[PDB]
């Protein structure tokens, strides 16, 4: 089980990676909209 | 000064003086002059090539200055503008006004306040607009 346990733990770390990537993209889009609004 | 400039046939400069006059008059709790000046300036600037893009903004101010008198005459006012300048419907000001009207129609102060917060978050609000929105909220 140690093999499966450790690999699933790396998978959980990878879930955190995915969450960070998605949140970063969302924040980038929000700042995107802010600047685009500002120029006008 | 605006009278002199108009008498000199130098347009686009008297307009700024009248805009300042209307903006300051709206502060003293006298709204008729502000509404008249704002609507006149907006309709005048509608037809100009360069100034056209700014025209919409003026209307919004009048609407706010028209909201204090009574809510009924504000709703109708919006209609009068939208039919004349259909592109006004595209700007965020129309949506904000409709949402504020819907929130106020049922004493839902919280929805009005939340919409104001969201609009301010997207773009910072001016002191004039902040004060006028606070005054409207009092009702």
From Swiss-Prot, chain A:
Basic and acidic residues compositional bias, start-end: 1-20
Membrane spanning residue stretches: none
Name assigned to this protein: Synaptosomal-associated protein 25
Post-translational events: Palmitoylated.
Start and end residues of each stretch annotated as Disordered: 1-23
Organism superkingdom: Eukaryota
Cellular location(s): Cytoplasm, Perinuclear region; Cell membrane; Synapse, Synaptosome; Photoreceptor inner segment
Family stated for the protein in its record: Belongs to the SNAP-25 family.
Function: t-SNARE involved in the molecular regulation of neurotransmitter release. May play an important role in the synaptic function of specific neuronal systems. Associates with proteins involved in vesicle docking and membrane fusion. Regulates plasma membrane recycling through its interaction with CENPF. Modulates the gating characteristics of the delayed rectifier voltage-dependent potassium channel KCNB1 in pancreatic beta cells.
Swiss-Prot record, chain B:
The protein's role, per its UniProt record: Required for vesicular transport between the endoplasmic reticulum and the Golgi apparatus. Together with GNA12 promotes CDH5 localization to plasma membrane.
Residues annotated with Phosphoserine modification: 48
Protein known as: Alpha-soluble NSF attachment protein
Subcellular location: Cell membrane
Domain of life, source organism: Eukaryota
Record note on quaternary structure: Interacts with PRKCABP, and disrupts the interaction between GRIA2 and PRKCABP, leading to the internalization of GRIA2. Found in a complex with VAMP8. Component of a SNARE-like complex that contains at least ZW10, USE1L, RINT1, STX18 and NAPA/SNAP-alpha. Interacts with VTI1A. Interacts with STX12. Interacts with GNA12 (via N-terminus); the interaction promotes CDH5 localization to plasma membrane.
Family: Belongs to the SNAP family.
Gene source species: Rattus norvegicus
């Amino acid at each position: 089980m140690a093999e499966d346990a450790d690999m699933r733990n790396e998978l959980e770390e990878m879930q955190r990676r995915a969450d960070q990537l998605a949140d970063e993209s969302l924040e980038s889009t929000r700042r995107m909209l802010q600047l685009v609004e500002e120029s006008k | 000064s605006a009278d002199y400039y108009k008498g000199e046939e130098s347009n686009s400069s008297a307009n700024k003086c009248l805009l300042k006059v209307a903006g300051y008059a709206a502060q003293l709790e006298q709204y008729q002059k502000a509404i008249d000046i704002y609507e006149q300036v907006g309709t005048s600037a509608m037809d100009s090539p360069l100034l056209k893009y700014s025209a919409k903004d003026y209307f919004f101010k009048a609407a706010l200055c028209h909201f204090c008198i009574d809510m009924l005459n504000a709703k109708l006012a919006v209609q009068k503008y939208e039919e004349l300048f259909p592109a006004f419907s595209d700007s965020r000001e129309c949506k904000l006004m409709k949402k504020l009207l819907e929130a106020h129609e049922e004493q839902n102060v919280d929805s009005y306040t939340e919409s104001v917060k969201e609009y301010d978050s997207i773009s910072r609000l001016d002191q004039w607009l902040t004060t006028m929105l606070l005054r409207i909220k009092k009702t």
